[model samples]
Target chain A: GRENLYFQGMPGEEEERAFLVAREELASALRRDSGQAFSLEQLRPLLASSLPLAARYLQLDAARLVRCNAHGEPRNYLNTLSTALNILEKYGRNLLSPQRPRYWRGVKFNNPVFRSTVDAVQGGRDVLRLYGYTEEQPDGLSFPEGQEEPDEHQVATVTLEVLLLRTELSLLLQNTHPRQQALEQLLE
Target chain B: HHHSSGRENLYFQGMPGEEEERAFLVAREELASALRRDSGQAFSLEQLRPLLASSLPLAARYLQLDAARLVRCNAHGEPRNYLNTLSTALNILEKYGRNLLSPQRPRYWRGVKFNNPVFRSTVDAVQGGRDVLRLYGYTEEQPDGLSFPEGQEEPDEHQVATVTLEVLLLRTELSLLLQNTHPRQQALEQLLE
Candidate 1:
């Protein structure tokens, strides 16, 4: 009964799907803009735009999916989605189309805002800690206070989305698989 | 202006010889004793007023005796008078008292001459007095000389020894006493008398 109520697959599935879709769009945009031999500097503008866009899409997807599952009401989901979209757009303008940094390296995104958003997302994930969602490693987002650049190993743009997808997919497969014990052991 | 000009006029009357030296030492001892007695207590201007006023008589007597002795010793040569000793003593006293007032301490210097003629004489008196007391295995109850031992390499130690008493007490006492006693005007009267 507890498992049915709480652990009915992972939370934020719809949001996770939307986030992955946005990530795909960003990847596609990057592919169309810079083919194979793209430098970070050359990709800098797109990277900057993509960061905010990715953040927005993830936030929107999360809000939509969370509302939809919690209450099977389309109006509720739409309302939450709209609010999330507003936040996303606000942050998008702040990060991507900032007035000060008119051109490429003009205005930097507000560090605290970025950090807080990231922290909020991580906290959301922590709510699923009872179901053993344990990828607690830092995602490669370097906030402004830290002078060092993001770690190259973790800096791949699609890694966070991929991680979320893998986690969700594993949960989906576990439900369908014949050998429940094997699947549970595999999860362990 | 009156006080300063009076001091200037008064200092012009010089005293001479061992008498001036003795008088300088006596005045210095009187100041040192007073300060030493009130060492732990905070010195107040009001308290110092009467005490300093009382000291003026001793100071004047010392000045007169010194001037008379200087004149007697050197009818023609430069007189080793109370003027130089008084000025030097007062200056040193000012320095010492200023330090005391501001929570500082004092240091004795061998090189410091108490009025040029009386320098050798006064120093001799101080040294002889210390030596005589020491010979009898007597020493001041309070620690003598600089606060720190000689040849100590510590900068903080050196500074504490040198400036502490000067800053805290000596300067303060000088200001208080000068305010109350009006030593300069008194000196002029004594000289005129």
Candidate 2:
């Protein structure tokens, strides 16, 4: 059950590559003035469905997947997926506990990747502080007792906790504060 | 400008514990009075700059003023590091003075610790309290006052853009960092040859 909480499902390399390509198309669609943005909502299925899978496959715990939008689903799934991918690629593999259960190590806070990400996220979290966001607990300093080697579950917990910061980053990027003139142009 | 060349250390005859605490409180008062007298309504960053510079040591130490955090905390005009520091210090001192000065509490009343067994608890307390401080308007976006312009939307738009761009840069940097560390499939293929 504990393992089930963090490890949801995995996507093959090709699936991952397709998801990346789809994200690029979505961003381009949103940026284009050629009526692509009119029915851009259709691409929501492609972007939104892949994200939770990528999020889980990348070892992000479901509970820590804080939402950025106010309603049912986030509008900026593409950016969120991109941010999550960057976070996982950067700090996920190293800071995560070794997969072997016999090793039984807790989350490794000592790693430079973990600490630096914590520092960066902490700063960004405060700067982007607004309504609808949950706060990150300062869990950088604690761990379970008498643990030697690393544990995958514990790493997933910490990784997802920091990964939550990506939600806010996605919100900031999606909040393109273009003037009313630009908004009119976008609609046109 | 004259004092910019060399680092000048100011030595004061004072003991730690309550004595140091009293000194901090005194400096806090001086900062308060200076703000009231120098400005009409809200405190001016210009006035605050000098007052805070003079009282920086005690205020920074006892009040636990982090310039970086203050910069992020500012919701008002241009960031004068010392201005925000003083503002945060005054708010904390006024509200949590007793908790900060009490002997029953831990030596680090601010609850920021390096390696204590209960370090997480300390951080949780301080960080949560800081979040509450924001809710309570510790660094509110002020109206037209002192060096502050009446129109703030201009600054806010630029600031939002700057921070958004910074997040993008950080993501790119993280991606590159991962690329450097992890070996590519092509590299492994070359090794197989």
Candidate 3:
């Protein structure tokens, strides 16, 4: 890991090269003219079927593998590209934030940078996801205990709870507007 | 059937715990209202009483407002920072809000680790919801919306070329007929004379 694949640290030469390769391939696939927009047959398979395998091989538990298309097959090109880019970014960036297995290590993140990095990736995860990608949960957000992290002796500060819930609600409705669009599009 | 596991199921525990639950619903409603600011709502709080104190509450409010704002304006129209909204705020709280369990004096958040289980669960729940959205094949980024150049018959490239060839051949046939038209007109005029 060079430093931070997501931010702060520059990508290593190999990482740079990898992304560049994918970029060229994506440009070709996403080319509008020549009847090649979102082409399924770009020369380089840099972002392709084997994407999930790459993620698992790296044990990128923090990274979400988003490669599947609408029909439940990994038939999408852009999605695979997004997953590879996000995973590789997380893999190379070794910035330790409050990520994964919450209960085990007293789950908590103090570093704003680290948390933001995860949040950003997680956010993009949703953004690309809007385009119909197979979504996977990062291990950190799973049923991790974080030791239930000793939140003892604290009264339910209804205020904080209320506040937190507001954040939660927005996130829950994270796709509402987009969903409305989907609905209207389908209706048409 | 796309069943809705909406806000109702989000918070656990049997009945009320009424006080907290009501506050939670009101806040949820408020957030919803904020996000729905498309119709001139402008994400204003009916009552600021609830929005006072602590960063996340404020953040949650901001996220809804900003997200609504982002959605309302076309992409190129508004130059807004995508990263600076409720997500960042939640990250802070989810990471460190437990530090300040009580609001006493200079609020020593570090000492009192008040990690609200509901809060954590909500965060995960929301994330999980997005995952659900993903499986459903919906996303937030607008399509590239590419429009092919005029006369470019995409997805049917061969047809376009064949059409081009046929049109050129048709023009050639018409040209030969056109060449004879002048002499034909002259002959017709002679007959009329």
Candidate 4:
């Protein structure tokens, strides 16, 4: 039976304790299911939903997901998915995979293709293919043959994997609890 | 003939007018009296000169008994005699007895301590009463004291009231220091205390 959760204390304190439990559960689940490609599209929303619970417990703004807008309208589901992918790439396997590609033990269950993608994304001479920009031609690469260089507006396309890697890494490093603790200690 | 004319000129120059001399003396006495009666306390040379010249009827009408005019005359008629008379008048006014009893309050009095017990007590009473009333709030029964009502949240109210009281006390101390008659040294000591 699911146990009853008691929240009859300070709102901030309760939320903080809850977030700790949630984080621990997440970390343990990832460790147990190594090299499994978890779909972040579904998993990210769940993580986001748990933020308010964490915020209430910790009495702090701890949510990582952010709203994305295109032409003033919200891309709600897409934004959540993008943020989740980015989070995974930044703090999860992206960092370890680059330095040690053969080390499968470091691979989390959330991202099985971590080592392969990291290599494909970073190591290459072809600019377009490395950045996920490809041409639909046998002879030419990146852009269509005899086509003028892609215009500024037409050339722009979202690289889901790259964007995820950049944003997630930045966010995780910035809000790392140990780093914040060290900073607080220095101030004291 | 030229020598006789020169002798006649000398005789005219030597003529002495007693009535003119007496009139000049009266003008001098009037100026001295006006200076003694002045109540605005300290009189500078600028203020004194105007008042003295104004008190003399002839000088007042003409506005001519100023320091420069008294020393040198360039008027159309009776110029030398008038200048001589005005000069004598000013001299007499300067010699007149000043009113010693009129306690010319010192400008330094602004910094003096109030030596009188009653004055100090009155100042203290007003300031103290104002402070007490300010902290507690006004009431008819307690005119000079604060009144705390029953079942009221007093912490925030008291904090605000206390701040106001402190400001009032600071202003009162500044006022007392400015108006006191003690020397600067003593007044500053009292303020520090």
By DockQ, the best candidate is: 2
How well is each residue in A1-188 modelled by candidate 1, as lDDT tens digits?
A: 01111111223464443333334434333322322233434332322232233353332233323333333343443343333333332322222221323331122224454334422332232222211222343442213443232221122233323223223323333453223342222223
* lDDT digits (tens) for residues B47-146 of candidate 4: 3233222223323222211322322332224533433333333322221112111235333222213343533443222323323222333222333323
Report, in order, each candidate's fnat.
Answer: 0.00, 0.00, 0.00, 0.00
State the number of backbone clashes in model 3.
14
State each candidate's clash count.
43, 3, 14, 16
Docking class of 3: incorrect
TM-score of chain B of each: 0.24, 0.21, 0.20, 0.19
Whole-model lDDT for model 4 versus the true structure?
0.29
Better model by lDDT: candidate 1 vs candidate 4: 1
| TM-score-superior candidate, 1 or 2 | 2
Sort all candidates by DockQ, best to worst: 2, 3, 1, 4
Q: What fraction of the true interface contacts does model 1 reproduce?
A: 0.00
Chain B of candidate 2 vs. true chain B, TM: 0.21
Q: Each model's DockQ?
A: 0.01, 0.02, 0.01, 0.00
* lDDT of candidates 1 onward, in order: 0.31, 0.32, 0.27, 0.29
Q: Find the 10 residues in a row with the least total lDDT in model 2 chain A.
A: A124-133
Q: Can you tell me the DockQ of model 1?
A: 0.01
What lDDT does candidate 4 reach at residue B77?
Answer: 43
Q: For residues A1-188, what per-residue lDDT tens digits would candidate 2 score against the true structure?
A: 12223433555655555444544443333223212222324433333343443342233322323332222223333233333334443333343323432322233334443433333322323221211112333533322344443343334333333333343333233343223232122123
lDDT of 1 at A101: 31
